[PDB]
Structure formats: structure tokens, C-alpha cells
Amino acid sequence: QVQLQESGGGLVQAGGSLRLSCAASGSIFGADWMGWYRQAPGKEREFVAGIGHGASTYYADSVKGRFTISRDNAKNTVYLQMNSLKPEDTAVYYCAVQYTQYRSYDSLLYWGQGTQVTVSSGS
Amino acid sequence: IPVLTSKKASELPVSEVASILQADLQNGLNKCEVSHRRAFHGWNEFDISPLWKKYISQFKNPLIMLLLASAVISVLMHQFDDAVSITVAILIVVTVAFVQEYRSEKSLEELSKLVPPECHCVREGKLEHTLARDLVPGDTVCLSVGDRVPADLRLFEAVDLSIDESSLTGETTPCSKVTAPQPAASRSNIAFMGTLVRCGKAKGVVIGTGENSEFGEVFKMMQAEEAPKTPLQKSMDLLGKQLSFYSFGIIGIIMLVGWLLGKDILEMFTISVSLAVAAIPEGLPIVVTVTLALGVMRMVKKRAIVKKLPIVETLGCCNVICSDKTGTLTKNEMTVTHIFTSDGLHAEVTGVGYNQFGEVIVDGDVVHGFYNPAVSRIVEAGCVCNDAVIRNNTLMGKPTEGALIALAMKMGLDGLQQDYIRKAEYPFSSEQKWMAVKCVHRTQQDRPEICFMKGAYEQVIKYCTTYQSKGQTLTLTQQQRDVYQQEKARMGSAGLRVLALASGPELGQLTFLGLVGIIDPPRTGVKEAVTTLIASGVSIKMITGDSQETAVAIASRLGLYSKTSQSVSGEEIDAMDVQQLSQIVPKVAVFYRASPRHKMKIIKSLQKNGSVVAMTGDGVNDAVALKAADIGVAMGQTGTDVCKEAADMILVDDDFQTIMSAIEEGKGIYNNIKNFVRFQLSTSIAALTLISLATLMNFPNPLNAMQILWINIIMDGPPAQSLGVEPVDKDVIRKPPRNWKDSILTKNLILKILVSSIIIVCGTLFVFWRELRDNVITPRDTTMTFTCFVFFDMFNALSSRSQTKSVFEIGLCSNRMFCYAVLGSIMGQLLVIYFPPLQKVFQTESLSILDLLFLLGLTSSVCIVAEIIKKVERSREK
Ligand SMILES: Nc1ncnc2c1ncn2[C@@H]1O[C@H](COP(=O)(O)OP(=O)(O)CP(=O)(O)O)[C@@H](O)[C@H]1O
Ligand SMILES: [Ca+2]
Q1: What is the per-residue burial (b if ≥16 Cβ within 10 Å, else e) of B508-529?
Q2: Which residues contact residue A58 at a Cβ distance below 8 angstroms, ignoring those fewer than 6 apart?
Q3: What is the count of structural domains for chain B?
Q4: Cα–Cα distance between A67 and A76 in angstroms, integer?
Q5: Whether residues B512 and B531 fall in one domain
Q6: How far is CA B314 from CA B229, B309, B535, B628, B739, in A?
């Protein structure tokens, strides 16, 4: 089983640049889908950025055009870069990995512990 | 915007109703249009709902009335100090009860404010979750399934709305709501505030705010109802009446003996009145109220809303907890992840949540649109046949419908929902286990009506006569049924909720397209709370309407289904009448395919076996079970407003361990009341025995009336109400659940009461004899006897804190109220001995230090005996 470890989150000001990375213990080659999800109080879990099997990049409608997602099998770590972040879209970020599957029906959905990012209004 | 009546708005059509309110039916009112109508009409609350009246309300307690009668009699017999002492006792106990009630009610109000009524409102073109209070007339509110209507609306969109109006109209049968105007109670287009949406979806425009609601007077009169007295409070009032009446008989015997044998009649009357005030449990209803209120506060600080007080007594008696898999044991974040077509292809759907993000992959190849036909018809049926929407990444209807909608948006087949025009709809009921819609296509109206059906595999396959293979329709064969059942059981064994889909001409002649496996992860912390409640002896059972494999897999993952455990279908429950069901129902851990009728049958059968069931189910249809159970638990964060309106208790943070904490405080309430009962009864029997022996054996009375009234203030006031404050232990975590019967006077408790009374009486009489040997009744004798009894009572209060644990184990300083009350009583006794006007009113005299040391050493013996009995019983139990 491949373990996921999240890092890079922290306190940033509005309009700044931020980095984020979920690293995997094993090689991320057969994973047909990998994404990120905000969890914030008073609302459900929301998709942020992800990529799939056919190397097609998926971005959320309220996120599109600002977040850049990449992956590298050499360092087995999926990385995110945020620019022009606003105070109102801050939450805790989760990395999710899904694997292909055949005789069983169990889901190979792996999550990270999550890293919390807080953004306040600029002063 | 002027206010419009509902009848006029019912006669009038929707377009003009929007016009007069200047309402935007699609985009909704922005903040600017909201602010002006908020300034004009006001907020949506029913305006604003006497502390001195609540303080006065406590005095109709019958024991307080008896004490008031005694004080009146003391006034009539010109006894100033006696009346003052009795009135001070009444005032202090009433103040304690009043403060505790007020604090509990205020904390409950704060917790209720922490969960405000909410609704789905579209204001800036974005559907948001807005409080019902913030609504202004003309706003556009979207009504979902299991929603309490936030304000009086005029529905301009209503496909299959079915709203029950039992609270308002008084008819339990829900009434269908149609968006057509009604020419000339009978308003089939106005959604009144306070009703609940049983079925369907709608969008309406609000026509009323504040007192403009047509049926707000019932909710106005609702707040003025007062909660009846708790059954524990009734039984403990009855118990206090018994104790007061037995003590009245004993005191009358004392007075008759004193008169016939020859003593001062006025002195015997004062002693009789003081003893009657003594032995009456004036603090027993007060300590019951304090324990109940404190339990309410503690479980409020556990983030649990207690709607009804008689639940806190009952959570202690709970022994079986029946829950629902969907919404209670699982987080209800449902998602289609596996598709098994009728042909035999397997499709894996990636991504999680009610979103379009993710793809359907068949044999390693992504499939979109109509690349794979069978998956496309599966997705089309799953999209069209729902009453749920996903707007701005937020779900409206049932989560299992939203999973199908999200799957359709993943495959890009969402627009097929709009292309079909529904003309006939079969409403979903849990008894049916399936739903269907008959639709025609917008582009091709010449095509015949096609019906889409989704539901449980058995119910769907009962209505299918054909199936799909490689793109052609063939007659359904038996080995196809066998492989479909095998695959369905295979997904269910992996924890997938299986939905079967059929599309075809009319009903009973459909084509079975296949199955979709809906993953519902279990709620976090449920497994550990199940383990804790099993360790507590509280059995946990699962009642569901889902398949055997899914329920069994979920319960196995949680841990309430062991390898040697039994699972029983709803049909077997139907085949079992009362006698067999009553004996099988403790053995079963999983009830699958059970309708709400079967769930209510399970609750009735478990209650018939002397169990206190705590149903923690959710669902717009599972509310008769919640009302039928002894305790009804709901989830505050993720739960329908139907359940939260029907529930007796609401978990704010949606945590299963909170039910365990509620049970623990339910046990601690009775433990603290037992502590008070044993302390007060032991000291009352001690005083009564002393006076009885003095009158029988012709010795001078060891205690006079003011001393007996101070002993009352100790025995029923703060030193004894402090024992109802005594904190809960961890032993109640392991203790077997208490019988629902009261059984307050345990034989062991009565034996320890009689032991404490016997040592107190013997030691006090020994001190009396030691200072009476000289045959002169100097008031130093009376003051030694008084201090002996008071210190004996103080050590008895130290002993009575916990029945089983030693005093060193619980801690001397653990109960701060007890320490303060003990210090106050010690200081009061020192004042009575050492303050010359108090000496004159109490007929006492100063004492020496060595005499006090002797009294302390002698009075420690009752605590020593109690500790010895505690250690002996603890060693015997091990
Ligand atoms: N929107 C829907 N359309 C069709 N079938 C549905 C449905 N929602 C649920 N079902 C099916 O109805 C059946 C019975 O469901 P029911 O309402 O009795 O309890 P439930 O399964 O919805 C929640 P639980 O199992 O926790 O009680 C299940 O097999 C379920 O798959
Ligand atoms: Ca009393």
C-alpha cells in the first residue's frame, strides 16, 4: 500500500504565491486519477485540481486559470502552485489517488491526512 | 414591496406575483433589493417571545407547601426564630433550583441558536444556504426533500411536490403542490411556513415575512406550552410524600408519648414542628431538578441538543441502539463507482462527490457521450429518473439520486434530463423500493413515451421482461438473472449500494440495462463508539432497507456484526409474529430490506422485551420510528429537518460517542439522587431516633427546635444538594444499564442508611451520657450533643458522596460545592457555639478545644465504618 504525505501548506497573504505537494511512497504510474479537495466548515468537499488517465487536466470552475498541477514519477510527488489566491477560498487540502481495477469491487481510493491553509484579508 | 395575502396570491398567477414583489424568478434578489424589504418588513422571526414568575413557580411543590405551612404555624405560635429558619431553608433550596433551571435553559437556548433554521435560497444567481430569518419577501427559495418551509412561498416550479401539513392543518396525509394558479387551507400552490416537504422538489417566491404568515398563531401559541413534569420528578415527589408521611406518623407518636408521659406541651409542639421540617425531603424534588438540569448542561457542552427533558432520565436506561446505515452509520456522501451493464461489460467511475469531475473507464478506455451504448442508457435513466439537482456544486435531493446526477455530469449526459418531459411519475416510497417516470423527447415528440425506472435489484427485475445484449434487445433469461444476482452480491459484499435500472415502453415491459454500485463510506468514529457501547452492555443493531450484502459488509467494517452473528430480512420479520420476533430480535445484528413498518415493528418488539431503544435513524420516511422509539436521535450537521423536528435529541457535531456520554450522564443522575437520598434519610432517621429515645427513656431532649432546624438546613440544604452535584465517574462506562424502573431504595442502600443512623445515634447518646453523668443538665451538655450530631452529619455527608468508591479514590476536593457547604456548616456550628446572641437563641454554651477534638475523633467512626463496608463490598465483588 502506498502512503500519501502532504506538505507545503502555510499562512499566505492574498495575491501571493504558494506551493503544495503530496508525496507518495510508491511509484505513481498505474493511477488513473489523482486530484485535490478543499474541506471547509459549513460546506461540502470540493474539487480543486486533478489529472486523469489520458493526461487531461481538470480544474474546478471557481479555481480554473490560477492553480497549476504537475506530477513527476522520479520524485513520486504531485505538486500544486497557487497564484493570485484570495482570502475567501481557503480551506484544508486533501490529496486523493485512485487506482485501476478484475474480480473485486473494493475502491482503491487513498487520501492524505491533510494540510491546513489559512488566508486572511490583506492589510 | 407591499405585502400580499396568500389567498390573493393563490388566485393571482405567478408572473404578477413576481411583479408586485419585483421578484427575479431565476437570478433572485441581490443584496440591495434584500436590504430595503428587510428595513420595511423586518426580520422573519415572530417578534420577541417573567423571571419573577418563574421564581414564584417553584412554590407549588407540595413539600415546599408543607414547609410553608409549618412556618405559618410557627408564626401563629409566636415562634419568630423558627419561622425565620424554615423560611431561610425554603429560600435557599428554591434559589438553588431556580438558578440551576435558569442556567440550563439559557445554555439550551445558546445551543439552539448554534443550529439555526436554514434553507436553499438563490439570490445572486448562486444557490446558497441562507438562514430562514434572513428571508425578505420576493426572494426565490428552493425546497428539497425533507425541508421545513422557511417562509410562506408561492411555488412557480413544482414537479412532484408532496408536503405534509399535520402540524398546521391537522391532516397527516401529505397534499400535492402544483404550480398552476388556483382560482377562488385549500391553497394547492402556496407552501406555508412550518410545513415539511415529504417528497419532490420545488422553487418558490416568498410572499410573507414575520407576522404576515397566515398560520403563525399556532407557532406563537406553541412557545407558551410548558413542559410537563418528568416521570422521575413525579416518582420522586411521590417518594418524598411517602417519607414525609412516615415521618409525620413517627413525629405524632413522639408528641403523643410526650403528652401522655408528661412534658411541656409547647416545647413538644416546637420539637414536633422542627422535626417535621427536618425529616421532610424538601431537597429531594430540588435535587432531582438540579441533577436533570445539570445533565442537560453537560450534554449541551457535549454538543447535543436536548429538545425534551424526560429524555435525560431515559438515556441512562438505554440498552439497545438501533440505527440506519444511510445517514447515521455512513456519512451519506454517496457516489457511483462501479457499473455492470446488462451485456457484461464492467465500467469503473473515478472521482468522488456530487460533481462532474471524473470519468467512466471501460477496459482501460475513457467513455464519454454515447461511446458505450449500455452505459449511456444506464446513465440516461439514472439522470432522468431523479428529483434531485446539483446546483453550484451543492446537492438538493436524496444523496443516492445526486450520485446518479454526478455520474451523468461525469459522462456529459446531464442535458438528457432537460430533453425529456415528464408527464407521469410514480412517487418513491420505501415500501415500493423503486421509482419510475414516463417521458417523451423534446426533439422527437413522435417517439412513444419511454419509462425509466430505478430501484432495488429485486423490485426492478420483477418489472423487466427483456434485457440488452451487445446493443440488441433480447428476452430475459434465467442465467442472465443468475449472473446479475451474482454480480449484485459481489458489489454488495464490497460495501457498494446497488441500484438497478430499467428503460422501456410502459411498465412491466421494460429493458434491464444493468446495475450501478454506489459507495457510501462509513462515518468516522462510529466503530469506536460501537465498541464502547458494546463494552458498556448497550447492544447496537442495524435496521436498513438496503440489501443483505451491503448492510452486512458495512456492519462488519464497523464491528457490530461478528462472524457468529445473524442477519434477518424484512420479509422474515413479516413472517414472524410477536412471539418469535421477541426472541429472535436480540440475536440479530443486521436487519436488511426492512420498510419503516418493519423498523417500527422491530422497535415495538425490542420495547416489548423490556428494553429502552434509542433509535438514531435519519431519512424523510424514517420519522415514525423516531417518534415511536423511547429515544430519538438525529444528526444536526447532516440530517433532514423532518428528523430534527421529530427527534427527541439532536447531535450537533454528528458524533456517535455523544450518545454514550448522554447515557453516562443519565446514569450519573440516578447515582447522585441515590447519594442525596441515603445522606438525608440516614441523618433524618438519626435525629428521629434520638428524639424518640429521649421521649421514651425520660432523658432531657438532646436537641431543641432551633438546633433541629439548623440540622434541617444541613440535611436538606447546600450540604445535601451538593451530593446531587457530585461528578460522574468512569464506572458508569462499564456499569450494566439501569432498569427503566425507579427502584430508588435499594436494600443495600437502606442497610447502609440504617448503619449510619445507628452509629450516629449511639455515638451522640454516648456523648450525652458522658456529660450527663453528673446529673446536672448544663447547656454544655446540649452543645456537646448538638456538635456531635452536626459533626456526625458532616462525616455522613463525606461518606455519602459515592456508594462504592472510597472517599480517597473520588477525592476530598473533587466536589467543590460539597467542600464549600461543609466549610459553611462547620463555620455556622462554630458561630452557634461561640457567638453569644446565637448562644442565646440556640441555648448553647462555649466548648473547649479538647472537647471538640474528642467529638471529631468519635464522629470519624461513621466514616471509618462506611469505608470498611465499601472496601469489603469491593473486595467481595472482585
Ligand atoms: N432515489 C431512489 N430511487 C430508487 N431507488 C432508491 C432510491 N433511493 C433509495 N432507493 C432504494 O430503495 C431501497 C429501500 O430504501 P429505503 O428508503 O427503504 O431505506 P434506504 O435504503 O433508502 C436508507 P437505509 O438503508 O439506511 O434505511 C434501497 O434498496 C435503495 O437502493
Ligand atoms: Ca427537611
Answers
A1: eebbbbbbbbbbbbbbeebbeb
A2: A35, A47, A49, A50, A51, A52, B357
A3: 4
A4: 20
A5: no
A6: 14, 9, 19, 14, 10
What is the rounded CA–CA span in Å between residue B712 and residue B280?
9
- Same domain? B638 vs B690: no
- The three three-digit cell numbers of residue B271, written as one number: 420539637
Q: What's the CATH code of the domain at B706?
A: 1.20.1110.10
Which of B334, B400, B496, B573 best tests ligand 1's pocket when mutated (most atoms within 8 Å of CB)? B400
Residues B324 and B344 in one domain: no
Q: How far is A28 from chain B (nearest CA, A)?
A: 16
Decide: B410 in ligand 1 pocket, CB within 6 A.
Answer: no
Does residue B185 belong to any structural domain of this protein?
yes
C-alpha–C-alpha distance, residues B355 and B611, integer Å: 44
DSSP assignment of B728-774: P-SHHHHSPPPPSS---S-HHHHHHHHHHHHHHHHHHHHHHHHHHTT
**Experimental method reported for this structure:** cryo-EM
Contact status, residue B316 vs residue B653, Cβ threshold 8 Å: no
Contact residues on chain A for B129, CB-CB shorter than 8 A: 42
What is the distance, to the nearest Å, from the Cα of residue B179 to the centroid of all Cα atoms in its chain? 38
Residue B13 sits in which domain range?
6-44+135-224
B566 and B417 in a common domain: no
CA B563 to chain centre: 32
CATH fold, domain A4-119, is Immunoglobulin-like (2.60.40)
B393 contacts in chain A (CB < 8 Å): 44, 46-47
Burial track B821-830 (b if 16+ CB lie within 10 A, e otherwise): bbeebeebbe
Which resolution in angstroms does this entry have? 3.1
Pair B325, B561: CB distance under 8 Å: no
For A10, B148, B192, B199, B811, the CA distances from B196, given in Å and listed in that order, are 44, 4, 9, 9, 51
Burial group, residue B506, by CB count within 10 angstroms (0-12, 13-18, 19+)? exposed
Q: Are residues B559 and B602 in the same domain?
A: yes
**B108: in domain:** no
| Rounded Cα distance, B395 and B9, in Å | 30
Q: Is B433 in the pocket of ligand 1 (CB under 6 A)?
A: yes
User: Is position B387 annotated as part of the catalytic site?
Assistant: no
Neighbours of A103 (CB within 10 A): 5
Q: How many whole angstroms separate alpha carbon B234 and alpha carbon B237?
A: 5
* Pairwise CB contact (< 8 Å): A98 & B364: no
Domain coordinates in residue numbering, chain A: 4-119
CA of B433 to the centre of ligand 1 (A): 6
CA distances from B454 to B36, B346, B368, B611, B823 (A): 46, 19, 22, 38, 72
Task: Report if residue B662 sits inside a domain.
Answer: no
DSSP 8-state symbol, B680: H
Which grid cell is B541?
443493531
Answer whether A100 sits within 8 Å of B338, measured CB to CB.
no
CA distance B519 to chain A (A): 8
Cα–Cα distances in Å, from B7 out to B4, B41, B161, B190, B204? 9, 19, 20, 8, 16
| DSSP states along B443-500 | S-TTSPPEEEEEE-HHHHHHTEEEEEETTEEEE--HHHHHHHHHHHHHHHHTTEEEEE
Please report whether residue B660 resides in a domain: no
Are B591 and B568 in contact by the 8 Å Cβ rule? The answer is: yes
A105 vs B351: CB contact, 8 Å cut-off?
no
Q: Name the residue at shortest CA distance from atom 4 of ligand 1.
A: B455
- Known binding-site residue numbers of B for Mg(2+): 618, 622
What residues does B390 pair with on adjacent strands? B395
Nearest CB partner across the interface for B358, out of A33, A100, A101: A33
A-B C-beta contacts closer than 8 Å? 64
Phi, psi angle pair for B698, to nearest 5°: 60, 25
Domain boundary (B484, B519, B554) is at B519
Q: Other CB atoms closer than 10 Å to residue B68's CB: what's the count?
A: 15
Are the CB atoms for B373 and B471 separated by under 8 Å?
Answer: yes
